[PDB]
mmCIF file of C-alpha atoms in Angstrom:
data_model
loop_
_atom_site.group_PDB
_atom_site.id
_atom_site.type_symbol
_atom_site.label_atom_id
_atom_site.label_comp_id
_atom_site.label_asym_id
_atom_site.label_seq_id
_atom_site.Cartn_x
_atom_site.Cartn_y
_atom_site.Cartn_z
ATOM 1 C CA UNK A 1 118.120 -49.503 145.291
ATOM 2 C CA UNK A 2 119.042 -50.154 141.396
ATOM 3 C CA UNK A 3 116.933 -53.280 140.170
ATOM 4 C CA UNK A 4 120.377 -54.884 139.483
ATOM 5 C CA UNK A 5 121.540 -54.785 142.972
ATOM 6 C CA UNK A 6 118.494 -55.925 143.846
ATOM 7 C CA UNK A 7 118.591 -59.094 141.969
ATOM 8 C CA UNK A 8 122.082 -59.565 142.774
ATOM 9 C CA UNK A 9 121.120 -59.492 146.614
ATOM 10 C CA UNK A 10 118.382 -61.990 145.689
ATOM 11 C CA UNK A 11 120.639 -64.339 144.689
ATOM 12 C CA UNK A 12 119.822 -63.872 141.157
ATOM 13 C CA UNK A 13 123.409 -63.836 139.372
ATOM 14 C CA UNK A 14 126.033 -66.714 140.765
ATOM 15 C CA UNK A 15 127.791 -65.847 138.193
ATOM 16 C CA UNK A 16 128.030 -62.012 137.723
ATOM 17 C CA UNK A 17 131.346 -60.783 136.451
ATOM 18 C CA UNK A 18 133.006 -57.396 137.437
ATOM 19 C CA UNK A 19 132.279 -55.748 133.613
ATOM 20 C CA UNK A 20 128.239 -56.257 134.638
ATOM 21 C CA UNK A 21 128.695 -53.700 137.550
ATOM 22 C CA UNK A 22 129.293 -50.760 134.478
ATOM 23 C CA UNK A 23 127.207 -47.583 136.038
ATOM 24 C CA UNK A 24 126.659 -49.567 139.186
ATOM 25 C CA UNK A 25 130.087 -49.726 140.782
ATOM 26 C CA UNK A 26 129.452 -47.085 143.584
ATOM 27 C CA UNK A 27 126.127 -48.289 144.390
ATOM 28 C CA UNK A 28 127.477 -51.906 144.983
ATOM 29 C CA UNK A 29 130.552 -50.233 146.633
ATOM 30 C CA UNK A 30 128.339 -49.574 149.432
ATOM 31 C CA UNK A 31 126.432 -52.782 149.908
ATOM 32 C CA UNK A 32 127.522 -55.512 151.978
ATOM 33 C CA UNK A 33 127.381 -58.082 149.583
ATOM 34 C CA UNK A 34 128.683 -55.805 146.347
ATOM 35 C CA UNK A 35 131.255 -54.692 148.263
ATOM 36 C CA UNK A 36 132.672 -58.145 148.971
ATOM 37 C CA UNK A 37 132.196 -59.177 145.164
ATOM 38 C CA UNK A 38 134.165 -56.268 143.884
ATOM 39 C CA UNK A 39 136.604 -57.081 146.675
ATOM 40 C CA UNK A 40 136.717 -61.071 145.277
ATOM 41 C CA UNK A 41 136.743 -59.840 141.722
ATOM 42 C CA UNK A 42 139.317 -57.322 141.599
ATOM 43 C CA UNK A 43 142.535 -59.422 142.576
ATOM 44 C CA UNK A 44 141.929 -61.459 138.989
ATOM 45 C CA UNK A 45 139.743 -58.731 136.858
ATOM 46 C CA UNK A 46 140.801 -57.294 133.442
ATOM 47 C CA UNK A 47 142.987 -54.324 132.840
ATOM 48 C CA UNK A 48 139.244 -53.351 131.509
ATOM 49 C CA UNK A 49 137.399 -54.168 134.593
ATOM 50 C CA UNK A 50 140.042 -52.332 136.814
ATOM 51 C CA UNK A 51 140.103 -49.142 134.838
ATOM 52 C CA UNK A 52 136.439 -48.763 134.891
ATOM 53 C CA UNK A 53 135.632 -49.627 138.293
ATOM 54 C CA UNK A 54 138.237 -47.263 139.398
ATOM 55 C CA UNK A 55 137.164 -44.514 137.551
ATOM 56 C CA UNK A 56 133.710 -45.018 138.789
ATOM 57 C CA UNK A 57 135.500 -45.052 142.405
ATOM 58 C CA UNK A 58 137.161 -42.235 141.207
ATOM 59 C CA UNK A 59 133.735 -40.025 140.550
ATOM 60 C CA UNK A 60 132.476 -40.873 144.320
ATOM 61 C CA UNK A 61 135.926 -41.026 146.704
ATOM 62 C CA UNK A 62 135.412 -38.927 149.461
ATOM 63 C CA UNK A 63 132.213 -40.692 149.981
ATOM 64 C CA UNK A 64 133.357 -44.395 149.084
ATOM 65 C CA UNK A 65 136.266 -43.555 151.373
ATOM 66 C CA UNK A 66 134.154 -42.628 154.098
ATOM 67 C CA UNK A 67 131.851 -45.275 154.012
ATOM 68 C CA UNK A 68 131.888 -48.818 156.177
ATOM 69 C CA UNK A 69 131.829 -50.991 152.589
ATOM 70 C CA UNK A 70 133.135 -48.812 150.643
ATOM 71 C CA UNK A 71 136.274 -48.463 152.169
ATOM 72 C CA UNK A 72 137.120 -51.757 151.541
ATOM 73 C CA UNK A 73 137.130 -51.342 147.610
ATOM 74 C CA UNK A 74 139.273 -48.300 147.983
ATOM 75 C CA UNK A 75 141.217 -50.518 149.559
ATOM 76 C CA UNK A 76 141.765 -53.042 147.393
ATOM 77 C CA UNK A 77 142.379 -50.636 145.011
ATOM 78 C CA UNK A 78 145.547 -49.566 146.560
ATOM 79 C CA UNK A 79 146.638 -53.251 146.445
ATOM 80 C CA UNK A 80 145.730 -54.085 142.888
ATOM 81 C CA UNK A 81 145.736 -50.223 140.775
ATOM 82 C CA UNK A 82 148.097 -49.697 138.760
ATOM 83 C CA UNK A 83 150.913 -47.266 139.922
ATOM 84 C CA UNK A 84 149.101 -44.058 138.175
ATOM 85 C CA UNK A 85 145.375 -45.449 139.301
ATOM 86 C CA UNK A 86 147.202 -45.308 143.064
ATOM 87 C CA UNK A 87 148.171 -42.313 142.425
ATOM 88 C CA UNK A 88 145.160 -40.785 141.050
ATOM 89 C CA UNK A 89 143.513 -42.321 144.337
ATOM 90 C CA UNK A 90 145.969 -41.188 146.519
ATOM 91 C CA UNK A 91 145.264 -37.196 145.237
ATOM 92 C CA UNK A 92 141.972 -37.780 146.567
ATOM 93 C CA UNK A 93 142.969 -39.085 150.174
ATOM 94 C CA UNK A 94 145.718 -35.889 149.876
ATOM 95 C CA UNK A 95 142.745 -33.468 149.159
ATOM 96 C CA UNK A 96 140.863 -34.786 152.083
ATOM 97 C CA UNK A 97 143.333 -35.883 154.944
ATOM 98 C CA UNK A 98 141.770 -33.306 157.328
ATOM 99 C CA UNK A 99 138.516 -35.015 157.354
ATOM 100 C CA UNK A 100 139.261 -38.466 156.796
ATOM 101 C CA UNK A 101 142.009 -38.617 159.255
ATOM 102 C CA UNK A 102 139.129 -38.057 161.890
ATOM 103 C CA UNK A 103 136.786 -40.646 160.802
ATOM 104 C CA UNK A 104 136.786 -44.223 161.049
ATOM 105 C CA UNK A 105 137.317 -45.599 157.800
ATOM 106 C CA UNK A 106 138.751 -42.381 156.265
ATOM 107 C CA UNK A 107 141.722 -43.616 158.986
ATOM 108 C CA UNK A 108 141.840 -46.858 157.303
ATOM 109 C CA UNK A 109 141.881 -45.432 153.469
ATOM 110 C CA UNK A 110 145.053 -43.108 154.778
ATOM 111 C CA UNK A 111 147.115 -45.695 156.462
ATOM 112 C CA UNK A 112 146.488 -47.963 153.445
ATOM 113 C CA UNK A 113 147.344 -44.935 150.736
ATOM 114 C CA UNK A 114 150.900 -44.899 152.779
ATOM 115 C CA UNK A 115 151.677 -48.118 151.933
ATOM 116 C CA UNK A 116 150.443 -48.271 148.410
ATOM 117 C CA UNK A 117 151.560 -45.132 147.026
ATOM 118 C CA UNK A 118 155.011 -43.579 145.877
ATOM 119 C CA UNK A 119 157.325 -41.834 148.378
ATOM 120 C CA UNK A 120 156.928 -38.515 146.889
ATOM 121 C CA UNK A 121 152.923 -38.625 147.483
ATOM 122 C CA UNK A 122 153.420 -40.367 151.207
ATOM 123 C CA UNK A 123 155.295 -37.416 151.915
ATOM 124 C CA UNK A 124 152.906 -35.014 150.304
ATOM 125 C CA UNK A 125 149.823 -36.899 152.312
ATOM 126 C CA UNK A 126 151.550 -36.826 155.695
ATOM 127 C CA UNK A 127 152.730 -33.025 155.042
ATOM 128 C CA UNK A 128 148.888 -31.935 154.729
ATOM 129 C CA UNK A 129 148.888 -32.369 158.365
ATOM 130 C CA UNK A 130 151.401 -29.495 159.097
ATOM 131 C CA UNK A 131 149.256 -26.838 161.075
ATOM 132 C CA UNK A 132 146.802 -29.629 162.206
ATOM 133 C CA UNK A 133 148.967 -31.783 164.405
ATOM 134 C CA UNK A 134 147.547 -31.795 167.912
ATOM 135 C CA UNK A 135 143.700 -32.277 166.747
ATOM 136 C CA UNK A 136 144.589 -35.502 165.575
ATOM 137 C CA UNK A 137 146.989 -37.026 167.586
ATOM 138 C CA UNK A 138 144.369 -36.324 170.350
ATOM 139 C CA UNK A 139 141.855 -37.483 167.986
ATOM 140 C CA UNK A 140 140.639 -41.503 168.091
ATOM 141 C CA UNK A 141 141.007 -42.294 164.643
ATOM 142 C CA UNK A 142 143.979 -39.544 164.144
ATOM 143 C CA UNK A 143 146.450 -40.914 166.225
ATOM 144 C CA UNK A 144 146.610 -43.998 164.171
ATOM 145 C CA UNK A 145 147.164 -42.203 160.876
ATOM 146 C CA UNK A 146 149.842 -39.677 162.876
ATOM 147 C CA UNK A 147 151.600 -43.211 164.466
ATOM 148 C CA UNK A 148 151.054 -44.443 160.506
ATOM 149 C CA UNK A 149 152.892 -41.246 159.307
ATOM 150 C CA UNK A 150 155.588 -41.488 161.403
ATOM 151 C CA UNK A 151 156.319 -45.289 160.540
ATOM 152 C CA UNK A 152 156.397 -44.352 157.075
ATOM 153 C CA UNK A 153 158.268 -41.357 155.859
ATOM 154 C CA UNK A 154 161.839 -40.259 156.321
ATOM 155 C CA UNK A 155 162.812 -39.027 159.824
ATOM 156 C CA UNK A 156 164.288 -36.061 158.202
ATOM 157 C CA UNK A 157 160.521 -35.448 156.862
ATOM 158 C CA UNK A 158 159.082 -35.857 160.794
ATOM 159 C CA UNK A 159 160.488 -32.438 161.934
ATOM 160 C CA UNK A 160 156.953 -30.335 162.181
ATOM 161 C CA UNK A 161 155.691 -32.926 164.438
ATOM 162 C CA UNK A 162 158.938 -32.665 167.237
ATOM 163 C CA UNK A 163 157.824 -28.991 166.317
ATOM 164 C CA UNK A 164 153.994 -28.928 166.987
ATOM 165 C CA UNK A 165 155.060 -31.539 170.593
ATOM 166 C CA UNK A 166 157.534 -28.446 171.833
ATOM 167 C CA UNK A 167 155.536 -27.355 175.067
ATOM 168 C CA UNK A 168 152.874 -30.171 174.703
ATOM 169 C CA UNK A 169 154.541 -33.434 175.505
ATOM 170 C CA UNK A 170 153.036 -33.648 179.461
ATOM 171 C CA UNK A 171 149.781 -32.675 178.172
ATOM 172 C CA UNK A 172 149.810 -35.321 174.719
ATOM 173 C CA UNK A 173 151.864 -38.031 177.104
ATOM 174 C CA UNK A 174 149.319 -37.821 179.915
ATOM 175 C CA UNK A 175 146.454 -38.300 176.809
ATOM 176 C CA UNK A 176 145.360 -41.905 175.948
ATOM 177 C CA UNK A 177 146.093 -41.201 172.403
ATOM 178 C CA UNK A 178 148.619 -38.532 172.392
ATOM 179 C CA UNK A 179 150.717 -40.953 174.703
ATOM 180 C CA UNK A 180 150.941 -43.261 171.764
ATOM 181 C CA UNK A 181 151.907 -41.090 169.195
ATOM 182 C CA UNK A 182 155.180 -40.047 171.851
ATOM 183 C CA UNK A 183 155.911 -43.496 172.128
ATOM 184 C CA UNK A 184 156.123 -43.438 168.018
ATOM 185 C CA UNK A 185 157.961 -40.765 167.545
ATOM 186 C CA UNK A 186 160.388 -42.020 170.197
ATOM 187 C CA UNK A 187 160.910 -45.288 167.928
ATOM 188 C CA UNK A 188 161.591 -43.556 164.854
ATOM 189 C CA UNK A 189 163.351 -40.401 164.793
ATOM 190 C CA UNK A 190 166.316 -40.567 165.854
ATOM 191 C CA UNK A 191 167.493 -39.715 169.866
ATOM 192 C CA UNK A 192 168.699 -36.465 168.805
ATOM 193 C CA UNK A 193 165.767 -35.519 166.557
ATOM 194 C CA UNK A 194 163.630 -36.522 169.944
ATOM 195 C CA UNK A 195 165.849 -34.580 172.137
ATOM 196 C CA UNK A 196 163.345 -32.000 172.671
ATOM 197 C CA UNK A 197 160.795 -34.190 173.704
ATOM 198 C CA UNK A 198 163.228 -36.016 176.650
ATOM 199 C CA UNK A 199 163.647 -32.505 177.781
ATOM 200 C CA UNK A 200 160.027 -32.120 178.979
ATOM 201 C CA UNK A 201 159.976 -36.092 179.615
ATOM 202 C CA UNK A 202 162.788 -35.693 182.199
ATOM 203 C CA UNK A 203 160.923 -32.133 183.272
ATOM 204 C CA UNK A 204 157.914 -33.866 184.493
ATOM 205 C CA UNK A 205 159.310 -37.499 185.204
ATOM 206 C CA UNK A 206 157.142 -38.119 188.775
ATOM 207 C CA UNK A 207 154.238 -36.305 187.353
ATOM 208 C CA UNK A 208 154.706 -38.805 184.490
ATOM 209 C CA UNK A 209 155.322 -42.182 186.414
ATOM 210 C CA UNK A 210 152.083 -41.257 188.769
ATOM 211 C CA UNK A 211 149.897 -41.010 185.491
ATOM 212 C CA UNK A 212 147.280 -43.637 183.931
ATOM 213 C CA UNK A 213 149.384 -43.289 180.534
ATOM 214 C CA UNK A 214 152.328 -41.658 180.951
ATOM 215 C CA UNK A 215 154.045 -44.199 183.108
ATOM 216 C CA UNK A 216 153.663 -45.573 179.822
ATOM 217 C CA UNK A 217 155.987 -43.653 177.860
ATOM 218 C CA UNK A 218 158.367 -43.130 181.000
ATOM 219 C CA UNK A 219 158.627 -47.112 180.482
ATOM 220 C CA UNK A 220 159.190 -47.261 176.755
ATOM 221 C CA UNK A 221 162.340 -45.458 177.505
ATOM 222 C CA UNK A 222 162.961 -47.559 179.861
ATOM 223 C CA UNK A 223 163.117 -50.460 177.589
ATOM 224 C CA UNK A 224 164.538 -48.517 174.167
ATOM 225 C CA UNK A 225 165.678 -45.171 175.353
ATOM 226 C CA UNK A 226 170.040 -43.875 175.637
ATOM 227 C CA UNK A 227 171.593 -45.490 178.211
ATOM 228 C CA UNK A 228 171.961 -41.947 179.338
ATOM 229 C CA UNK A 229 168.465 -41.332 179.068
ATOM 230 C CA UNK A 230 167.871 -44.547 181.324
ATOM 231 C CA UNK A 231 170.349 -43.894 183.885
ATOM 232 C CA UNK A 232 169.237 -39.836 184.756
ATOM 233 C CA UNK A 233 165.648 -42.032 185.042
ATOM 234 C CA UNK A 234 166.705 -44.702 187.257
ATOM 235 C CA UNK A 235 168.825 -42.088 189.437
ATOM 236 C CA UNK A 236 165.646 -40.127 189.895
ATOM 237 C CA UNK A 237 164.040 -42.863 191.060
ATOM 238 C CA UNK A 238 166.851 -43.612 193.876
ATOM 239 C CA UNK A 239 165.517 -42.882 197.033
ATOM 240 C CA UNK A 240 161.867 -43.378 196.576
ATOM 241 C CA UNK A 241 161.738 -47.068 195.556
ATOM 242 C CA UNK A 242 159.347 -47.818 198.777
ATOM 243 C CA UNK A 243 156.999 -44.653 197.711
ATOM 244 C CA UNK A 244 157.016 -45.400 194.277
ATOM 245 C CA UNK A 245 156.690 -49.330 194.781
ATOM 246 C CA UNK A 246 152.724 -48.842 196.078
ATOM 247 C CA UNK A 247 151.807 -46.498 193.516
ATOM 248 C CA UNK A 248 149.620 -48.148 190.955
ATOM 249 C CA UNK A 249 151.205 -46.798 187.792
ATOM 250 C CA UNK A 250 154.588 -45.916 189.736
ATOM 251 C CA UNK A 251 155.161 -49.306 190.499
ATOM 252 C CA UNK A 252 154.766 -50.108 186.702
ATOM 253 C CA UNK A 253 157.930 -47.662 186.310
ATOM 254 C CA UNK A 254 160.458 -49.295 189.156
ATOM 255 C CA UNK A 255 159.947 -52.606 187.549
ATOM 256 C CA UNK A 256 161.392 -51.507 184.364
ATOM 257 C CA UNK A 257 163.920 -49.885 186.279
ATOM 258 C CA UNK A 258 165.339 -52.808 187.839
ATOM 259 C CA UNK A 259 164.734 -54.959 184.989
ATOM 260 C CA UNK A 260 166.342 -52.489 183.000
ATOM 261 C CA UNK A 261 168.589 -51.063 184.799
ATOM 262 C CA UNK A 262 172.196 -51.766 184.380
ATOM 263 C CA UNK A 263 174.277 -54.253 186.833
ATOM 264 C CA UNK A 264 175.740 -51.550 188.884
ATOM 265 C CA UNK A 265 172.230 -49.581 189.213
ATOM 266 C CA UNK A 266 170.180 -52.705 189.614
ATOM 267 C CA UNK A 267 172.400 -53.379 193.071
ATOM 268 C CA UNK A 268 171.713 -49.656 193.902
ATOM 269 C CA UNK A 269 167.670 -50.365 193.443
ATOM 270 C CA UNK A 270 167.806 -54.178 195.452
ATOM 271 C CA UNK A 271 170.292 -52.826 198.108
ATOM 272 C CA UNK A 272 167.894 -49.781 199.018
ATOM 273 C CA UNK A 273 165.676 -52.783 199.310
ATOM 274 C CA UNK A 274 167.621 -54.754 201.795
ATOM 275 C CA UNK A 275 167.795 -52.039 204.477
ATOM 276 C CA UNK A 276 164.073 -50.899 206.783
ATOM 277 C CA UNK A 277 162.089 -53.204 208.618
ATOM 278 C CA UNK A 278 158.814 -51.642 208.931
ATOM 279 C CA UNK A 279 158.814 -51.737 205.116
ATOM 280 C CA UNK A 280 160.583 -55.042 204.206
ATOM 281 C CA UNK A 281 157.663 -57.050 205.573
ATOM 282 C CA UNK A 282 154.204 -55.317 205.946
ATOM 283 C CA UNK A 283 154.211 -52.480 202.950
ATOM 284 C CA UNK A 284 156.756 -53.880 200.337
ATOM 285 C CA UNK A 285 155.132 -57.342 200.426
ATOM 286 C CA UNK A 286 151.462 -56.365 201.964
ATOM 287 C CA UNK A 287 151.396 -54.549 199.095
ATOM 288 C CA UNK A 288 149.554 -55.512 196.011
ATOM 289 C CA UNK A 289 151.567 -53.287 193.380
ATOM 290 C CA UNK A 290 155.218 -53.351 195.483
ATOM 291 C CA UNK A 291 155.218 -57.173 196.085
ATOM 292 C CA UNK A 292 155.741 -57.185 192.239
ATOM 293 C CA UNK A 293 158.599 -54.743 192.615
ATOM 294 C CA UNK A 294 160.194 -57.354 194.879
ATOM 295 C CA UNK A 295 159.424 -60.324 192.537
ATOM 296 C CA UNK A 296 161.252 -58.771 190.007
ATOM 297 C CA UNK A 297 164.221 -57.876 192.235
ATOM 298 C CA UNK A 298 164.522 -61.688 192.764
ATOM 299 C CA UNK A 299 164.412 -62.204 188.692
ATOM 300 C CA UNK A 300 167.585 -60.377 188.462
ATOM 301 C CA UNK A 301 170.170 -60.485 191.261
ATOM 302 C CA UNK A 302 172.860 -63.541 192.863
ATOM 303 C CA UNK A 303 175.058 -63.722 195.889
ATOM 304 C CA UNK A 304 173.032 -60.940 196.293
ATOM 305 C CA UNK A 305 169.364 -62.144 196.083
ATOM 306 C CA UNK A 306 171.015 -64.595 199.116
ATOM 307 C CA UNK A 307 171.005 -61.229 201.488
ATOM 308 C CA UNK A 308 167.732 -60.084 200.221
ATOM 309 C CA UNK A 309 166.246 -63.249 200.515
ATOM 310 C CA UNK A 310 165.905 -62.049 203.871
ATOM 311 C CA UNK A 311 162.393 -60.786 203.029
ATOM 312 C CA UNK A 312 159.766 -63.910 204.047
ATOM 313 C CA UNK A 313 156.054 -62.781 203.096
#
């Protein structure tokens, strides 16, 4: 622990200025307290200050990067470089996306090197994952820098991804963090671009509603999805509405379809509601997951909730 650090943890210098750190920038990176000063100090410093403390940064990155305070300066550093400092940085995070991406502040130096940098370098960062795909969208930290990618960067520029999901979307959809990463891609390519991942969504869409997470991207189209896209849903879900209604994730999946759904499918979904007797009463409002299926048929109907309304606890 450098004598200066020392002191300033003891209180020693309320007045210490960013050119004091000189040869001591790394070291204070890593403190608690240094690494709040530099934060503080950079915002307002010199074009003096700036240029040495980032090429102090500069000589220890990967490990500044990587580190709980450090990070932080990196950070701030992508807010306040200058555009070739930024860049400079950014060459760094490029070098070492692979490891990085899986650790838990590498995650946050990545996502804030998207927003900082140039387009030409976001694309060259998020292109260094080509090859490596799965591993981190499966990965805890990874799937936030994959979601991160995908917000940022041209659609167009998103096409190994669809590529690497081909033949994987039940498995990464039925994954707490793959699923995630589907419902990002879903929101920013384009339904055409996606096209190959509806065709193993509507493959497996019943394996999908029945699943922890996985219901959850089955409902995301729901709510954003082609009409078409909705409707090929909703129809497979005709028939089934009382089966479906007392699973615990299922149940999650006929609500959005009858919220959802469009006038002349919602009366399909309510009507197949006010037929059966054994399962009006009992089952459809016993239940604690299909009760909420009829709630919401009452949210949306008119001369027809009047007929239904023929349910009573």
């Amino acid at each position: 622990m450098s004598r200066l650090l020392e002191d300033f943890r003891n209180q020693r210098y309320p007045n210490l200025q960013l050119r004091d750190l000189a040869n001591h920038i790394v070291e204070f990176s890593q403190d608690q307290h240094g690494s709040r000063f530099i934060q503080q100090k950079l915002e307002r410093a010199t074009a003096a200050e700036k240029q040495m403390v980032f090429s102090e940064i500069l000589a220890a990155a990967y490990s500044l990067m990587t580190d709980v305070f450090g990070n932080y300066v990196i950070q701030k550093f992508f807010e306040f470089g200058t555009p070739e400092q930024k860049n400079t940085l950014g060459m760094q995070v490029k070098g070492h996306v692979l490891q990085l991406a899986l650790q838990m502040y590498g995650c946050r130096v990545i996502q804030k090197a998207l927003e900082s940098i140039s387009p030409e370098q976001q694309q060259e960062i998020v292109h260094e994952l080509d090859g490596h795909v799965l591993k981190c969208v499966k990965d805890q930290n990874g799937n936030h820098v994959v979601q991160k990618c995908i917000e940022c960067v041209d659609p167009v520029a998103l096409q190994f991804i669809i590529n690497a999901f081909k033949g994987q979307v039940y498995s990464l959809s039925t994954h707490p963090y793959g699923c995630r990463v589907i419902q990002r891609i879903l929101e920013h390519c384009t339904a055409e671009q996606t096209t190959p991942i509806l065709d193993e969504l509507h493959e497996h869409t019943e394996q999908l509603i029945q699943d922890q997470y996985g219901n959850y991207v089955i409902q995301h189209v729901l709510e954003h999805g082609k009409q078409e896209d909705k409707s090929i849903l909703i129809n497979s879900v005709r028939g089934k509405v009382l089966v479906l209604s007392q699973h615990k994730f299922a149940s999650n999946v006929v609500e959005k379809c009858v919220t959802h759904a469009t006038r002349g499918e919602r009366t399909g979904l309510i009507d197949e509601v006010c037929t059966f007797n054994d399962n009006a009463l009992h089952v459809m409002m016993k239940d604690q997951y299909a009760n909420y299926v009829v709630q919401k048929m009452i949210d949306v109907s008119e001369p027809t909730q009047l007929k239904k309304l023929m349910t009573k606890i």
